[PDB]
């Protein structure tokens, strides 16, 4: 799975 803290500016949905 992706790391959500790799870039905090990315919301895990779009």
């Amino acid at each position, epitope marked *: 799975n992706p790391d959500p803290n*790799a*870039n*905090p*500016n*990315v*919301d895990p949905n*779009a």
Partner: antibody
Amino acid sequence: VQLVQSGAEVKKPGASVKVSCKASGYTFTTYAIHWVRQAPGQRLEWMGWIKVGDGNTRYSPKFQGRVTITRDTSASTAYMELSSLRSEDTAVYFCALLTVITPDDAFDIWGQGTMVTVSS
Amino acid sequence: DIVMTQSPDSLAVSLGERATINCKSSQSVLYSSKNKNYLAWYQQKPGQSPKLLIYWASTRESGVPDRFSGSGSGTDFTLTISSLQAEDVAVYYCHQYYSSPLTFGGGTKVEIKR
């Protein structure tokens, strides 16, 4: 919505450089500021990010011992300080709101870049 | 690190014809359950800062022209510029934001023939 960086610099090997990134046009605490370097003729290398809200940082392992990212919330400014400079650190250093992606919107903003030359 | 490799390193294409830029990641950047690829494309001109064209491998940023389109899934990604315009001369970079450190491809220079 702007990021504006400090001007070019020359340093000698073994010194440190501190670059600033003035943010304007949005609530400074909302997003994370990143620092990306581009050695002349080379690819982009991510250095690390700071959450402006709480001040938490993440650094790339290549720089983990040598770089410090900080911010002044009242000044609306982020800083990146690179220590123990080598000729190899000659590059353009950018600050950036990299890939702000929400369900509503997507944007991405970069500073104009700060050239740093390390030389004797 | 997820290593991003582009090909070709440089490309020369006539005004109005099709330009294809390739990107390979060293591991999959796909979140399979969300069919979401953590892949982006940037355009950079000399002396200027990069500009985001595409994210989630295939979604255009607002105000990016229709002639730019991104596709692919897993480890192989393509940016296609279908009807090349003079203002498109630039270096194009892929970018993953699946895992830390964030990483970028080596760049592909797109030159114009006229």
